[PDB]
Design a protein around this ligand. Structure first.
Ligand code: HEM
Ligand code: HEM
Lengths: 153, 153
């Protein structure tokens, strides 16, 4: 995992990418296609390009580079936000409170029960299965962070 | 993980929790502490709480329930958002474009390369390391989705 400052670093440098996304996207695809020409075969629009000069002149390749870095930007920003919610919890519950994963399971079961009890009409089998999985993913994500922090169980 | 359908069911029920969060939080903690007294032992600040009546009368247990469910809501909402960005990309790159993980490694290195070339003074070792790690997590996250989809990346 990344630390808090490392995630902010990622976001800061993506700010610079977005300030000139056309140029960044061009240079990234050109670096890819020249360093690793076998990757060009995947692109039915680009594979005919042979030289870096041709790649720089391609309007299609510039557009795609922007598509790619836009999508990656969103992925990174939303991953960082998710980790910003999870990390503080993992940190306190591993280091100060010392809460085993099993106990997170117990509270998960309690949540599921209270939901089913209070909202039987809106928390049928499909919903209940979805929440079960969501809380399991949450526990697995916390467990991994625990391990990094030197807290096992 | 979950589908977008399953994340929607999760987020929909969570709106009903938010509607009446204090009661939900109280009932979750009481269910937990009553089923699992060992969990109550972890709350040195709730050691005065011996019976259901006392738990129900506690200012601070009610406030804590709300803190817990508000934090979990944020974790779930931001996790769902992160997944909703990553899943479509994994899906197309697995099923349609058939992009090996190795090629995702190549573009990752290209990104790092271009960032260093364009921001030589700003993108030093520590920032490069942060970005290296974030792209590795991105690739691992894709890989996990590839497997769900039956694609060998
Ligand atoms: C950072 C990594 C990547 C991101 C964020 C990214 C993103 C995207 C996006 C947003 C699209 C358009 C929508 C879609 O089909 O999903 C796309 C299309 C595509 N991607 Fe990727 N991609 C990445 C890596 C790769 C790599 C390494 C390859 C091949 C070596 C590749 C091959 C393709 C192909 C062939 C298309 C369809 C292009 C077209 O016909 O217009 N992608 N990519
Ligand atoms: C869904 C699971 C959980 C969430 C979202 C959660 C959230 C929180 C939050 C937001 C705080 C306040 C800030 C902090 O210290 O990190 C907190 C404190 C705390 N939590 Fe949790 N928690 C969860 C599960 C548990 C479980 C299962 C236990 C114990 C068995 C536990 C024990 C504690 C303790 C002891 C504190 C400190 C209370 C104090 O003395 O003020 N947590 N938790």
């Amino acid at each position: 995992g990344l630390s808090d400052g490392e995630w902010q670093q990622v976001l800061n440098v993506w700010g610079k990418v977005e300030a000139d996304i056309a140029g960044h996207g061009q240079e990234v695809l050109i670096r890819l296609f020249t360093g690793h020409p076998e990757t060009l075969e995947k692109f039915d629009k680009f594979k005919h390009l042979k030289t870096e000069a041709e790649m720089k002149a391609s309007e299609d390749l510039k557009k795609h580079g922007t598509v790619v870095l836009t999508a990656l930007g969103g992925i990174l920003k939303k991953k960082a936000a998710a980790e910003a919610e999870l990390k503080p919890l993992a940190q306190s519950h591993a280091t100060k409170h010392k809460i085993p994963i099993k106990y997170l399971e117990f509270i998960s079961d309690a949540i599921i029960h209270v939901l089913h009890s209070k909202h039987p009409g809106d928390f049928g089998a499909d919903a209940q299965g979805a929440m079960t999985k969501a809380l399991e993913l949450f526990r697995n994500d916390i467990a991994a962070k625990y391990k990094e922090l030197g807290f096992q169980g």
